[PDB]
Design an enzyme around this catalytic site. Structure first.
Site, short mmCIF file in Angstrom:
data_model
loop_
_atom_site.label_atom_id
_atom_site.label_comp_id
_atom_site.label_asym_id
_atom_site.label_seq_id
_atom_site.Cartn_x
_atom_site.Cartn_y
_atom_site.Cartn_z
CE1 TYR A 116 -4.17 1.69 -0.11
CE2 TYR A 116 -3.54 2.66 1.99
CZ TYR A 116 -4.40 2.62 0.91
OH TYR A 116 -5.43 3.54 0.95
CB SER A 122 1.30 -4.58 1.80
OG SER A 122 0.68 -3.73 2.75
CG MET A 123 -2.62 -3.29 1.20
SD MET A 123 -4.16 -2.48 0.78
CE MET A 123 -4.24 -1.55 2.33
CD1 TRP A 144 -3.46 -4.66 6.51
CD2 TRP A 144 -4.86 -4.85 4.77
NE1 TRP A 144 -4.58 -3.93 6.81
CE2 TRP A 144 -5.44 -4.00 5.76
CE3 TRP A 144 -5.56 -5.09 3.59
CZ2 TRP A 144 -6.71 -3.43 5.59
CZ3 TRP A 144 -6.79 -4.49 3.40
CH2 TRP A 144 -7.35 -3.68 4.40
CG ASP A 149 3.32 -5.99 9.95
OD1 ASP A 149 2.68 -4.92 10.08
OD2 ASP A 149 3.46 -6.59 8.85
CG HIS A 154 3.93 -3.66 6.78
ND1 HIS A 154 3.12 -4.79 6.81
CD2 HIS A 154 3.66 -3.02 5.61
CE1 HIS A 154 2.33 -4.79 5.72
NE2 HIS A 154 2.64 -3.71 4.99
#
Ligand SMILES: [Cl-]
Ligand SMILES: [Cl-]
EC number: 3.1.1.74
Length: 257
Positions: A60, A130-131, A155, A175, A207
């Site tokens: 992200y 992440s995303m 995520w 994280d 993260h």
């Protein structure tokens, strides 16, 4: 035995630095493709072999440059690797999955001839931060023809992915963007029991651990890609009977051993 075998017998040490293949780089400009925001292809050069391909999504608000180190590392061990930029840096996980999907079709059909000459489009895999890692789980469930998926510090709001694609998840202990108790560990837990699956948790890492050269991410990502994309059982040793001080948790259904 094993048509897909590439490179020398592995040592742990060799897997923490760039591998035996020279790497060329091709910039895919944003406006030259529909369906994702361009990116960079890292791919072997100086060789007549073909190799599996990998599409990888940053996280992200991030650019493809955040994962350049890993795109180069993978390609240098014998992979064609496209690290995308997203249509918007604010795109969410399921948007990232659809762009991974577009990127894979691009690599197979429309990338430069020097790249296509190095790619075996029958063997493709996905990875993401992440995303981008949430996008990786989404596409692994939408498209079970993929050989492997590696979500890095992932995520997503959806916690269950019914996929037969072998998954290795990297969590980071400290994280706070995607706490492993809400994200990485539930994703691991909720994958089918019959699917080969590994979870590794990095001690004292946050993260941003995937954003820079990281020896554990290098070893586990290379090994999982090698084992499933190339059927290369020489890499089983790094994934089986694990006793790694860099890790603060390890889980597996041990189907890959
Ligand atoms: Cl989304
Ligand atoms: Cl050629």
């Amino acid at each position: 035995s094993n048509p897909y075998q590439r490179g020398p017998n592995p040592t742990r040490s060799a897997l923490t630095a760039d591998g035996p293949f020279s790497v060329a780089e091709y910039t895919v400009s944003r406006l030259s493709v529909s369906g994702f925001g361009g990116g960079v292809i890292y791919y072997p050069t100086g060789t007549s072999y073909t190799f599996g391909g990998i599409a990888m999504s940053p996280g992200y608000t991030a650019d493809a440059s955040s994962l350049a180190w890993l795109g180069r590392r993978l390609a240098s061990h014998g992979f064609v690797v496209l690290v995308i930029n997203t249509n918007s840096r604010f795109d969410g996980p399921d948007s990232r999955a659809s762009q991974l999907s577009a990127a894979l079709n691009y690599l197979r059909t429309s990338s430069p001839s020097a790249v296509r000459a190095r790619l075996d489009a029958n063997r493709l895999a996905v990875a993401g931060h992440s995303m981008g890692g949430g996008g990786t789980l989404r596409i692994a469930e939408q498209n079970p023809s993929l050989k492997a998926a590696v979500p890095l510090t992932p995520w997503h709001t959806d916690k269950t992915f019914n996929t037969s694609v072998p998954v290795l998840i990297v969590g980071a202990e400290a994280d706070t963007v995607a706490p492993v108790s809400q994200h990485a560990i539930p994703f691991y837990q909720n994958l089918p029991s019959t699917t080969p699956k590994v979870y590794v948790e990095l001690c004292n890492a946050s993260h941003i651990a995937p954003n820079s050269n990281n020896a554990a991410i290098s070893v586990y990502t290379i090994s999982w890609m090698k084992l499933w994309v190339d059927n290369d059982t020489r890499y089983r040793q790094f994934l089986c009977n694990v006793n790694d001080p860099a890790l603060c948790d390890f889980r597996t259904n041990n189907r890959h051993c």
